[PDB]
Design an enzyme around this catalytic site. Sequence first.
Site, PDB file in Angstrom:
ATOM      1  N   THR C  44       0.842  -1.177   0.150  1.00  0.00           N
ATOM      2  CA  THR C  44      -0.036  -0.039   0.081  1.00  0.00           C
ATOM      3  C   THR C  44       0.758   1.300  -0.050  1.00  0.00           C
ATOM      4  O   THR C  44       0.440   2.288  -0.647  1.00  0.00           O
ATOM      5  CB  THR C  44      -0.863   0.055   1.158  1.00  0.00           C
ATOM      6  OG1 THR C  44      -1.526  -1.442   1.588  1.00  0.00           O
ATOM      7  CG2 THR C  44      -2.153   1.178   1.153  1.00  0.00           C
ATOM      8  N   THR C  45       2.017   1.284   0.679  1.00  0.00           N
ATOM      9  CA  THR C  45       2.778   2.300   0.828  1.00  0.00           C
ATOM     10  C   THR C  45       3.411   2.657  -0.601  1.00  0.00           C
ATOM     11  O   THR C  45       3.865   3.724  -0.916  1.00  0.00           O
ATOM     12  CB  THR C  45       3.885   2.233   1.928  1.00  0.00           C
ATOM     13  OG1 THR C  45       3.572   1.933   3.240  1.00  0.00           O
ATOM     14  CG2 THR C  45       4.831   3.402   2.135  1.00  0.00           C
ATOM     15  N   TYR C 107     -13.529  -4.175   0.528  1.00  0.00           N
ATOM     16  CA  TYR C 107     -14.592  -3.420  -0.157  1.00  0.00           C
ATOM     17  C   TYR C 107     -15.828  -4.404  -0.559  1.00  0.00           C
ATOM     18  O   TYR C 107     -16.855  -4.345   0.178  1.00  0.00           O
ATOM     19  CB  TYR C 107     -14.160  -2.559  -1.368  1.00  0.00           C
ATOM     20  CG  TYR C 107     -15.166  -2.191  -2.347  1.00  0.00           C
ATOM     21  CD1 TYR C 107     -16.443  -1.834  -2.121  1.00  0.00           C
ATOM     22  CD2 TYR C 107     -14.926  -2.766  -3.736  1.00  0.00           C
ATOM     23  CE1 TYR C 107     -17.430  -1.669  -3.071  1.00  0.00           C
ATOM     24  CE2 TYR C 107     -15.981  -2.418  -4.897  1.00  0.00           C
ATOM     25  CZ  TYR C 107     -17.246  -1.885  -4.834  1.00  0.00           C
ATOM     26  OH  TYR C 107     -18.001  -1.744  -5.448  1.00  0.00           O
ATOM     27  N   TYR C 133      -2.100 -10.306   5.307  1.00  0.00           N
ATOM     28  CA  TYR C 133      -1.992  -8.896   5.730  1.00  0.00           C
ATOM     29  C   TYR C 133      -3.457  -8.444   6.167  1.00  0.00           C
ATOM     30  O   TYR C 133      -4.219  -8.601   5.345  1.00  0.00           O
ATOM     31  CB  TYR C 133      -1.481  -8.010   4.508  1.00  0.00           C
ATOM     32  CG  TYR C 133      -1.565  -6.527   4.773  1.00  0.00           C
ATOM     33  CD1 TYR C 133      -1.426  -5.742   5.974  1.00  0.00           C
ATOM     34  CD2 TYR C 133      -1.552  -5.608   3.462  1.00  0.00           C
ATOM     35  CE1 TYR C 133      -1.528  -4.544   6.230  1.00  0.00           C
ATOM     36  CE2 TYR C 133      -1.571  -4.230   3.595  1.00  0.00           C
ATOM     37  CZ  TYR C 133      -1.732  -3.657   5.097  1.00  0.00           C
ATOM     38  OH  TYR C 133      -1.500  -2.249   5.352  1.00  0.00           O
ATOM     39  N   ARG C 138      -8.712  -0.182   6.590  1.00  0.00           N
ATOM     40  CA  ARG C 138      -8.743   0.136   5.233  1.00  0.00           C
ATOM     41  C   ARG C 138      -9.521  -0.708   4.500  1.00  0.00           C
ATOM     42  O   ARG C 138     -10.304  -0.394   3.445  1.00  0.00           O
ATOM     43  CB  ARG C 138      -7.243  -0.132   4.531  1.00  0.00           C
ATOM     44  CG  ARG C 138      -6.176   0.796   4.847  1.00  0.00           C
ATOM     45  CD  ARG C 138      -4.809   0.541   4.193  1.00  0.00           C
ATOM     46  NE  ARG C 138      -3.729   1.504   4.611  1.00  0.00           N
ATOM     47  CZ  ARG C 138      -3.657   2.714   3.869  1.00  0.00           C
ATOM     48  NH1 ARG C 138      -4.510   3.301   2.835  1.00  0.00           N
ATOM     49  NH2 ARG C 138      -2.628   3.709   4.667  1.00  0.00           N
ATOM     50  N   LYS C 161       1.049  -9.977   8.841  1.00  0.00           N
ATOM     51  CA  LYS C 161       1.046  -8.696   8.994  1.00  0.00           C
ATOM     52  C   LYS C 161      -0.224  -7.907   9.689  1.00  0.00           C
ATOM     53  O   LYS C 161      -1.041  -7.824   9.097  1.00  0.00           O
ATOM     54  CB  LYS C 161       1.653  -7.785   7.617  1.00  0.00           C
ATOM     55  CG  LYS C 161       1.670  -6.240   7.903  1.00  0.00           C
ATOM     56  CD  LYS C 161       1.788  -5.431   6.628  1.00  0.00           C
ATOM     57  CE  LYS C 161       1.704  -4.061   6.728  1.00  0.00           C
ATOM     58  NZ  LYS C 161       1.833  -3.321   5.626  1.00  0.00           N
ATOM     59  N   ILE C 203       6.763  -4.549   9.274  1.00  0.00           N
ATOM     60  CA  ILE C 203       6.673  -4.166   7.676  1.00  0.00           C
ATOM     61  C   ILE C 203       6.226  -2.608   7.866  1.00  0.00           C
ATOM     62  O   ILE C 203       5.280  -2.192   8.175  1.00  0.00           O
ATOM     63  CB  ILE C 203       5.763  -4.914   6.950  1.00  0.00           C
ATOM     64  CG1 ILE C 203       6.197  -6.589   6.691  1.00  0.00           C
ATOM     65  CG2 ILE C 203       5.508  -4.295   5.550  1.00  0.00           C
ATOM     66  CD1 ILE C 203       5.287  -7.504   6.437  1.00  0.00           C
TER      67      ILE C 203
HETATM   68 CL   LIG Z   1     -11.885  -0.989   1.247  1.00  0.00          CL
END
Ligand SMILES: [Cl-]
Lengths: 291, 291, 291, 291
Positions: C44-45, C107, C133, C138, C161, C203
């Site tokens: 994501t980073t 989502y 992860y 998020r 993670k 991480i």
């Molecule tokens: Cl999401």
Amino acid sequence: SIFKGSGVAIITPFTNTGVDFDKLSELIEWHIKSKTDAIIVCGTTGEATTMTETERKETIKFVIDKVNKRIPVIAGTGSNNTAASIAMSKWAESIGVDGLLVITPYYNKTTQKGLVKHFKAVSDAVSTPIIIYNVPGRTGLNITPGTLKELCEDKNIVAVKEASGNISQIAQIKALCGDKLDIYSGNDDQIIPILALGGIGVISVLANVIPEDVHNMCELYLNGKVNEALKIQLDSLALTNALFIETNPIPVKTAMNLMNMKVGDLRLPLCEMNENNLEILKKELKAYNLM
Amino acid sequence: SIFKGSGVAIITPFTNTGVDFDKLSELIEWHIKSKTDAIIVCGTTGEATTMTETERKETIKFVIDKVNKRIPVIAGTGSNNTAASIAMSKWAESIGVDGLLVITPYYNKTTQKGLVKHFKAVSDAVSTPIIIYNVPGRTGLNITPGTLKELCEDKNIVAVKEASGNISQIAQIKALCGDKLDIYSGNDDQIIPILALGGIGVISVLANVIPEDVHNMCELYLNGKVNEALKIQLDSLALTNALFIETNPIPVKTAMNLMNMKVGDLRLPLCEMNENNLEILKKELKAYNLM
Amino acid sequence: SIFKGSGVAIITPFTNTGVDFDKLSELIEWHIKSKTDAIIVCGTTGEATTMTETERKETIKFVIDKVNKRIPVIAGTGSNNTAASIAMSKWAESIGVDGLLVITPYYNKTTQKGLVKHFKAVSDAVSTPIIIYNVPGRTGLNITPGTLKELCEDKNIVAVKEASGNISQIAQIKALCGDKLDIYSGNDDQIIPILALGGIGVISVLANVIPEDVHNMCELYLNGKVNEALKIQLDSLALTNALFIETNPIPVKTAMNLMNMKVGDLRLPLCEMNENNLEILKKELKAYNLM
Amino acid sequence: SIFKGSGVAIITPFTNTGVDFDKLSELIEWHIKSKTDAIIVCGTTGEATTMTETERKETIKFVIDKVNKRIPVIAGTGSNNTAASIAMSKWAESIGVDGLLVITPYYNKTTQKGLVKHFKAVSDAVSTPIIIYNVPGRTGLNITPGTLKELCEDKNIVAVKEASGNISQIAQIKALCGDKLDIYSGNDDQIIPILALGGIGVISVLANVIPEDVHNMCELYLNGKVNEALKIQLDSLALTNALFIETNPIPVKTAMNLMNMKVGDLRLPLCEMNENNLEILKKELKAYNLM
Ligand SMILES: [Cl-]
Ligand SMILES: [Cl-]
Ligand SMILES: [Cl-]
Ligand SMILES: [Cl-]
Ligand code: NA
Ligand code: NA
Ligand code: NA
Ligand code: NA
């Protein structure tokens, strides 16, 4: 119903040493003239927590005796100790209150199983209609629609003041409890959606400053004039949210004083607003023609 | 308005290798006969996430061409990548969709400042009405009433599908955005309270199985017959909540198949319901006369 | 273990049209010199969401080929579509990645039952260690300790993670999964408490700017020098929180550029920081001797 | 420090009409033999809420006089009414308590500005060390690290019992308040991660049943034997979570009675466990060799 429409959660006006009885008398007469449907005395808005027992009793009896049967009077009598909720409930019954506003336990909390025993022990003790008050943002505890379904069979338990702010949960109570439980909105910014799901009124902070608007919004909605009701709700929304910018009743007492009503200071741990929030309040009071 | 009343978030019927176009055609004709007001194609309910680009395009164009101007068709075209939301939006525009359903970014997320740039970059690219879709429980991200206020000035941005489930936030959008933003409820169990605050319909999962109820509930409410509308809402509430017992569209596809509609299997990572939840669904389908 | 200590979630440096490969090469060599323990590429980073497939593949292969077996390289290869997570995972395997960083669906989401099928379908497809992860803030979705317990029996699934930010849930995973699942902290401000519960590293976003601190904090903690490790954690806490003042990687890319590293602009829907938050970042960068 | 290591939040053993003083005496001697570091009397675990004032005073003085300077005794003396917190605090001071456990207001709540005035008004009244108790899941109210930073300058305010369950917020307090505020974990399942961030002990429910484990876990951790400490934490985790399966102290009183300690019944609104949760408790008590 104990009442329909706008039941004001009246502030308690404090002098620097106790209670301002004359000011309270003035507020009561104003509410009756302004068409407020009922008075809720010593609820959270009335700072019952920072009043002594004697003050709570003197205050509740004063509202009951001043109103003298003109409109319904409901006292907050619940606490997080079941024995104490029992004693206070019997006492307000004994001096002629028309309803009891009984909060779930808070802080100590309990299970859904304990909520049933809690409210049954309070109800069994009295013969006065009871309104269960659910406010999880304050108590840490949510009484579910299933627990309410089980309690609404009780003889005295006829209503809920629903301040979860969760409209899905409001629909659930109504679908489940049907005509065995009246719903009062416990949030002014949610009058419309709650009356829309079958609620029959509001126990109101905003009625402290605009009792006419809160009463007419309910009367209009319940009478089928849903658009006229909606407009009052939307026009007053920004003021209403301003009244929740800090822990209630900090903003509503602050506002009453800005409107020259002279209702005194809050008791600790409540205190004066901070400056930025004070300015946001004032802006909304002026835009709504209140100062 | 792009449409008023019931806009079905139509499932996508899958065969074991791709899309069941004949089944989709049958569903479309059924929706038009049943008085569904609009079709939302390849929304979340339509599992757009597990369809290839070609499938998403074939599916959207098929719904558009089959409906052939009879009722409005809205495509989900947003993603969490702004370039990709642009390309897909232009494409559905180019083949005659009547509206765009554009979700906030999700997972990557962004700030309120980025939401404005995100939606302006998508809108600038097209000339088709846009419905912003807010669903913080899925995206991790909440577009606020203030950000919506700023966006509603955009030429194409005319509406929001509001699935925050936060009725206070719904009132806030309406009070703030006024007549510059249509509100659609994004939750079936919240049709009444949202139409009550000035919403103009629902983009609906429950319309997949009872399109008549969802359409009439809206039509009745909007026409002033608020009690008749309320009763549909309360009677269908237990079924509606059953449809959310597991991640949608797991339960609604499961239910359609129990109602003999033969709409196929879900795609991973969605999968078959567990047994206890399956039984709760069936009980509610039978009590509502659906199997 | 795939690695112990500090695994940097490396930003992807963008030029105005694609990827800045030379800058990435410089960052990789700097990380190896600075004693970073592993590189996580296109997490994501690294803004994988706004990179095309070709960019994601070119970028991952570049990091793998530049590092050339000097330290472990882990690629983010998961998505919310199971078929796509399969194809990408096989592909990074095929070009010699040492680990796979595989996020839960987001989502679209799914049930705990679907999470098991999701991760089993990805794992079955490969023979490369997998790190699950979990980042519910998020994704909208929380993989529970019980689901993890069931998955840790899988041959490739060796680690998590954990970015729930819920330390009670971290203890639960460790007590339940024991020596069958390595825990990496997914939050820099939580390195100490997670290594303390048996975690074996982090991480890291903060390793983008101070790789030495993140590596030494882990090495010190794991070696029994818990006080020396604690002090790094507390001294860097205010900087670390500043890096989360807006959606990551907005602040860490902003900071790298303030430290003269010339890593380019973010891609939409990420965008430049607002001014007040920018000033708070700068203050913390200066107090930590970074500009 | 008022104490380091394990401070038991001792239950209050009730007879069917008041307090079981002999049982309490037995518990106190057992705690001292078992190496408990301090006794917290009439905290939430001690059901202070459902005790009369006389019972609370008799109980606190009894623990103080029985312990007779052997280990530190801390009384819960805070309430949501500032005048009442003042009177009770002065009173426990006057009879020789060594510390005061003072909860934030709850239910009525207040602002961060009021929290400062609340705690300053209590502290100003006394000359006894004070431990601020933060438990937002019970009170609805979170005292922030910034408010704590401002209060830690107060002469009597030396510590916090931190039961937010938010480890990021624990790090923040420590980084901000430094050596001006001791941190006690307010959750047993979080002893390790909190001692790891610089905490100096725990005010403990689990010490009611295994005082040796809670004391040794702290002593070991603080002495650098972090692995030996970690193992106690992980081995006891499932029991610990079982003790929170229903509102504490319902499960810990239930467990003590299952371990033949004869500590009596809970007072309403607390009540007996439901059956499924009772079985989960028993299973964990047996697996931990407690019955
Ligand atoms: Cl999401
Ligand atoms: Cl509370
Ligand atoms: Cl709501
Ligand atoms: Cl936490
Ligand atoms: Na009843
Ligand atoms: Na517009
Ligand atoms: Na494994
Ligand atoms: Na101090």
